[PDB]
Amino acid sequence: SLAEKDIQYQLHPYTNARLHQELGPLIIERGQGIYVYDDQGKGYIEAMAGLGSVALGFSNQRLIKAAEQQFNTLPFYHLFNHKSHRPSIELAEKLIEMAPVPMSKVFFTNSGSEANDTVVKFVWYLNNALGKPAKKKFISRVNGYHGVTVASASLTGLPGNQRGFDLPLPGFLHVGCPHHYRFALAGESEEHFADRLAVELEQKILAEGPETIAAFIGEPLMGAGGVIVPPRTYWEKIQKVCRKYDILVIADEVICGFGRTGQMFGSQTFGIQPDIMVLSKQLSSSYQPIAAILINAPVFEGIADQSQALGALGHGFTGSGHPVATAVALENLKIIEEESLVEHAAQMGQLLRSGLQHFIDHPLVGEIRGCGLIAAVELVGDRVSKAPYQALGTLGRYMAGRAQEHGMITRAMGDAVAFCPPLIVNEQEVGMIVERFARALDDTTQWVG
Amino acid sequence: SSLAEKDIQYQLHPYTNARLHQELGPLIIERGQGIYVYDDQGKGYIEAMAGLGSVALGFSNQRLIKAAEQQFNTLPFYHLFNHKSHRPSIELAEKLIEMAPVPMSKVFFTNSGSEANDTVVKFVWYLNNALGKPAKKKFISRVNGYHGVTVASASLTGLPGNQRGFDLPLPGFLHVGCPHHYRFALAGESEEHFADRLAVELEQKILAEGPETIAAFIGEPLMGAGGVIVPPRTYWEKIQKVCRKYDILVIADEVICGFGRTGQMFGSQTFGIQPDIMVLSKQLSSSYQPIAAILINAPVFEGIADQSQALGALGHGFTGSGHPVATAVALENLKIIEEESLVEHAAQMGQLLRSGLQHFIDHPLVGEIRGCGLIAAVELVGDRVSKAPYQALGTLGRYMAGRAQEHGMITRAMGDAVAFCPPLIVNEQEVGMIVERFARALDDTTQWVGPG
Numbered sequence A: 001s002l003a004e005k006d007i008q009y010q011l012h013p014y015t016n017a018r019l020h021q022e023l024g025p026l027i028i029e030r031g032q033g034i035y036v037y038d039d040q041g042k043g044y045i046e047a048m049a050g051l052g053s054v055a056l057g058f059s060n061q062r063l064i065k066a067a068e069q070q071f072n073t074l075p076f077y078h079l080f081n082h083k084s085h086r087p088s089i090e091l092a093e094k095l096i097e098m099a100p101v102p103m104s105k106v107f108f109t110n111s112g113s114e115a116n117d118t119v120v121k122f123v124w125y126l127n128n129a130l131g132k133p134a135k136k137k138f139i140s141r142v143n144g145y146h147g148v149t150v151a152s153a154s155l156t157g158l159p160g161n162q163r164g165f166d167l168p169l170p171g172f173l174h175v176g177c178p179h180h181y182r183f184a185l186a187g188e189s190e191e192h193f194a195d196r197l198a199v200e201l202e203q204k205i206l207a208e209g210p211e212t213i214a215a216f217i218g219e220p221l222m223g224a225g226g227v228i229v230p231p232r233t234y235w236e237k238i239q240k241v242c243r244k245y246d247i248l249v250i251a252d253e254v255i256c257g258f259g260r261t262g263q264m265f266g267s268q269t270f271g272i273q274p275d276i277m278v279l280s281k282q283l284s285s286s287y288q289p290i291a292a293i294l295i296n297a298p299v300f301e302g303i304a305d306q307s308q309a310l311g312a313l314g315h316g317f318t319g320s321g322h323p324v325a326t327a328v329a330l331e332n333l334k335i336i337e338e339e340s341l342v343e344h345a346a347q348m349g350q351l352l353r354s355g356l357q358h359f360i361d362h363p364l365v366g367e368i369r370g371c372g373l374i375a376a377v378e379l380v381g382d383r384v385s386k387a388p389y390q391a392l393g394t395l396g397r398y399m400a401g402r403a404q405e406h407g408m409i410t411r412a413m414g415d416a417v418a419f420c421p422p423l424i425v426n427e428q429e430v431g432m433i434v435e436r437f438a439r440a441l442d443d444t445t446q447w448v449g
Numbered sequence B: 001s002s003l004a005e006k007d008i009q010y011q012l013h014p015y016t017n018a019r020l021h022q023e024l025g026p027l028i029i030e031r032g033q034g035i036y037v038y039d040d041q042g043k044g045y046i047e048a049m050a051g052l053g054s055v056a057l058g059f060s061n062q063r064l065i066k067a068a069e070q071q072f073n074t075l076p077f078y079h080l081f082n083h084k085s086h087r088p089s090i091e092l093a094e095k096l097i098e099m100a101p102v103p104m105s106k107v108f109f110t111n112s113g114s115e116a117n118d119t120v121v122k123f124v125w126y127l128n129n130a131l132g133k134p135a136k137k138k139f140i141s142r143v144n145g146y147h148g149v150t151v152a153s154a155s156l157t158g159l160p161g162n163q164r165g166f167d168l169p170l171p172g173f174l175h176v177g178c179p180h181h182y183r184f185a186l187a188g189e190s191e192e193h194f195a196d197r198l199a200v201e202l203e204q205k206i207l208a209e210g211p212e213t214i215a216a217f218i219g220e221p222l223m224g225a226g227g228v229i230v231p232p233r234t235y236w237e238k239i240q241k242v243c244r245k246y247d248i249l250v251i252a253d254e255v256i257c258g259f260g261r262t263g264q265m266f267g268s269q270t271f272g273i274q275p276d277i278m279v280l281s282k283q284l285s286s287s288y289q290p291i292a293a294i295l296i297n298a299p300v301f302e303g304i305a306d307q308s309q310a311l312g313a314l315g316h317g318f319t320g321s322g323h324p325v326a327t328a329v330a331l332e333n334l335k336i337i338e339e340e341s342l343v344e345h346a347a348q349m350g351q352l353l354r355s356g357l358q359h360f361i362d363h364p365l366v367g368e369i370r371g372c373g374l375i376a377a378v379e380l381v382g383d384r385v386s387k388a389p390y391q392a393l394g395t396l397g398r399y400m401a402g403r404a405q406e407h408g409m410i411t412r413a414m415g416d417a418v419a420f421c422p423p424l425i426v427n428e429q430e431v432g433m434i435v436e437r438f439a440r441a442l443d444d445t446t447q448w449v450g451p452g
C-alpha cells in the first residue's frame, strides 16, 4: 500500500520515527479552498492553512496559471554573477515598495530557515566590514521560532529544536518569552512586565558587553511558540534598548507576513521599525518554496562595500529567486492586494476570536489569545495553578487528535491548540472551525473526567 | 524604470560584486528552450553549464511542466510533519531508495543542497548522541570542496570565497587536502603515491584530533564548483579504508554528480564509494523546482529513530520538506532520465566533448583537460612548465568566459579552469557547437595573450 511505502522509505520531520513505523501516515490526497482530503475521501478544514502558510487556500487557479506561464518561458535560471530574470526583479520591486519601513534590497532564499541563517552570515559580514569583529552575538527569545539550520535552530528558543542536536551554538543568547499569563509576577500589569523584559534585555547586553551584540531577532508575535502576543509597550521599549546600543532589530515575519495579524505586516501591528525583515510562507501561499530578506540602506551599503573588497558576495542558493517561485509569489501578493484579503482576514479574525471567547470560563481553558486571524486556546489541568494534566502537552495532543476526528486539522504547541486558517476563510467556515474546536473540547473534558 | 534599472535598485545578487553590479547592471535572461537561453536583447546562448550544473532535461521539457500542473490542480502544498504524508513524496522516496548504488534505508527531503548538508551535520550529531558517543562530532572535508552556504555547510565548504569575512569555518569542521594531482602532487609523484599521501594526511588528522571525536568525512565524488577536480586513481579506496578503520561515516555529496553526470547514475558508482549517507539535488528536478534529498543507510536511520522516540519527535524539518509539486516534478524527471536512457547518452556525449577539447591538448595556454562523463574543465596556464597563470590567477578564466559569452555560450570560470556541464539531452551536433565556441574563445584569448 502507499502507507507501507511511506513507512519503508520516508523519514518524517517532527515525527516519532518508531511510532510512525507502527501507525503509518495520514496521507493527504487533494485540496480545494480551505479543505484537504485524505486517501479515504474524508475532508478536513485546514484550520492551520498547512503550516500557517496557505493564504489563498488549496485551489487558487491564478497561482497555478502564473507557474505554468513561467514554466513555458524560463523554468529555471539563477541570479549568480550578475545574471537576472524578470520575475525576481518585479517581486523585489513589489516587496521593497510595500515594505512598512524604507528598505534598500531583497535577497531571496528557498526557506525561512535559510533566510535567517543568511541574516546571521550577513550581520557577521557587515560588522567585519565595519571593523567591529567582536560585534557578532545574536539575542533571541525563549520559545521563538526562526527555523532549523545549525545557526537558525540556535536562534530558535524551542527546546524540541535543540535537544540532541548540541544547540545552541556559542554566541546565540536567549532572553525571556514575553508571555504575561506564564511569566508576569503576581498582579503585574502588561506595561510593568514589558518594563521588566526591557530591563532583562539591557542587563543581558551589559553582562555580555554591548560591543559584542550584533542583533536582536523576534517574530512580532510568536507563532510556532504558541501564538504568544507580547505585552502592550514591549516592542517600543525593546527597540529603545536596541537603538541605545546600536543593535540591529530583525523582524522575523515568516508567519506574520501578508495579512495574518490584521495588517499587511506584524511590524505594522506591533509598531516595529526593523533594519532587516524575513518573509516566507504566505509570500507564495506555500505553492512554491521561497523566502525573502529585506535589508535597509546601512546594511546594504556595508555588505556592498565588503563584496567589492572580497571580489564578490560569497553566498547564494541555486534556488535563490527561482523564476517559477518568484512568479508565483508575485501573483500571490497581487491577489492579496486586489481581493482586499488583509481587511477580510481582520474581519474573519474578529469572528474567530469572539467565537473562541465563548469558552473563556470552560474548566480546561487557561487562556485564549491571538491577533487578527491567528489564535490559540491554551488548555490546563487546573485554572488556579495553571498546571498541565499529567505533563505539558498531554491535553494539546488529545485535543488535536479529536479535532482531526471531527474533520479539522489544528496544531498543538504544548497544551495550546492553534488556529491560522487561510485568509480566504468565510464567516460560516469560521463558525465550523469554532464548532469543531467545541466538539474536540467536549471530548477532551469527558476524557479528563 | 527599465527592468535593468529595477534590478540594480532592488536586488542584492548572490555571488556578485554588489558595487560592480550597480555599474554594469544585470545580464537579464528572458526565456529558454532545449539547451539554449536568450537574453532580453534576443541574443541566444548555449547553456553549456545547464544553469548551475542542474538543468538535466534542458529549458523546455513539457513532461516536467505538465507534472507540475497535474500536482498543482490536485494538492499544491502539504507538509510531512507529525505523520502527515502525500503520494509524490512517497513515490519519489521509493524511487530514490530503489535506485541507490548501496543499500539505503530512508529519504529526508529539503529545499536545497545547503539545507541538506546542514541537516546531515545535525543528523550525525543527533545519531552519535543517540549511540552514546557525545564526543564523536567533528566533520572532515577537503580544501576547494563545495557543500553549500549555511553557517554549517559553508564550514564544510573548502572554498575561501565562502568563508572569508563570514567568521567560518565553525570549530569542529576540519579540512584536509584538495585531491588535485596537477596542482598538489610532489615533483614526479604518481597518482597512487599522491592518494597514499592524502590517506596519510587524513589518518594523521584523525589521530591528532582524537579518533573518538571524528564523526564523518564528506566529499563530492568529483569536485564540481572547485574546478571539476577528478581525484587521483585509488583515492576513494584508500580514504574509505582510513574512514572504516576509525568508524567514521562516509558522506557522498552527489549534488552535482547525481543522475548521470559522470557516465553512471551516481559519482559513488563511477568512483567506487560505498557511502553511509548521500546528498542529492540540482539534476534531481532539473532545477525546475527547489528540492534536495538525503539518503541515510540502516544504521543511521535506526539510531535517529531510537532517539526520536525517547525525545517525543525528531525536532527538525522545513515547511517545504517533500513539497508535493517539487517531489512530483523530481519523480517525472527521474522517470524521463530512465525512459530516454540519458545516463548512457550522457556517457557518449561526454566522450565527444572530451575528444573535442583534446584537439587543444598541446596548445601553449592549455595546462590540463580533465573530467568524467559529461562534466569537463580546461585549465588554462600562462606557462605549461611552471603551471603559472598569465598575469594574476583567474585572468585567463575570466577572459575566456567573457569571449565564450560573446560567441553565444555560457561557461563558468573557476580560477583559470573553464567548465562544461551541459544538459544531459545535448546532442552530437550541439556538443560540436560547444567545442567550436570554446575554440573561438580560446583563439581570442590566445591573440590577447600573444604567447608567440
Ligand SMILES: *Cc1c(COP(=O)(O)O)cnc(C)c1O
Pocket (backbone or CB within 6 Å): A110, A111, A112, A113, A114, A116, A145, A146, A147, A148, A219, A223, A224, A252, A253, A254, A255, A280, A281, B317, B318, B319, B320
Ligand atoms: C516557518 C518559520 C520559519 C522557518 O521556515 P522554513 O521554510 O520551514 O525553513 C522561520 N521563522 C518563523 C517565524 C516560522 O514560522
Ligand SMILES: *Cc1c(COP(=O)(O)O)cnc(C)c1O
Pocket (backbone or CB within 6 Å): A316, A317, A318, A319, B111, B112, B113, B114, B115, B117, B146, B147, B148, B149, B220, B224, B225, B253, B254, B255, B256, B281, B282
Ligand atoms: C549546488 C551544491 C550544493 C549547494 O546546493 P544549494 O541548493 O545551492 O544550496 C551542495 N553541494 C554541492 C556539491 C553543490 O554543487
